[PDB]
Each structure stands twice: as C-alpha cells, then as structure tokens.
A = this chain, B = another copy of it.
Amino acid sequence: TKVTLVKSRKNEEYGLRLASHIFVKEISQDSLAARDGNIQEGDVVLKINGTVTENMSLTDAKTLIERSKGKLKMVVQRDELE
C-alpha cells in the first residue's frame, strides 16, 4: 500500500500521529539468547527490565541492555490474531 498526501492544496499540516516500535533484527550464535531459547529473529519487544520500549530511539534500547548488571528482562509479543 502506498500513502500519498498533499501539503499544499489545503492550508494545514498532515496531522498524523507518528510512533515507533522495537524488535530483534537477529540473534548472535553461542549467546545467552540462543541458550535461553526465548529471543527469535524478528521478535517484537515491548518492555525491557520492567520498562516500556515504545516510541523510544533505537539508541535508548541499547542502553537498557548496558544497564543490565546480569539478568536482562525483555517482554515480546506473540499473539497477533489468526
């Protein structure tokens, strides 16, 4: 689907609420994720260490992983209707 708008015809902005999500691009081999068997390639993360990770910058997500002294918590989504 292609979305085409015209910010000239009418004197007004697009007025569209833009947001962002977080997911796992991939997983490294011989890592904690591979051993844990929880994080999968393409997994969508919503919370980390008991904190929401929506509308945040990709950089911030990296920090949450650094803040973790030992145990890292990550809440991902699985149910998406069928």
A residues lining the B interface (CB < 8 Å):
1-8, 10, 12-36, 38-39, 43, 45, 55-59, 61-62, 65, 68-78, 80-82
The dominant DSSP class at the A interface is: mixed
Q: So how many copies of this chain end up in the complex?
A: 2
Q: What are some 28 contacts across the A-B interface (CB < 8 A)?
A: A1-B43, A2-B73, A3-B39, A3-B73, A4-B36, A5-B71, A5-B73, A6-B70, A6-B72, A8-B70, A10-B32, A10-B35, A12-B30, A12-B31, A12-B32, A13-B32, A14-B28, A14-B33, A15-B33, A16-B28, A16-B31, A16-B32, A17-B25, A17-B26, A17-B28, A18-B65, A20-B56, A21-B23
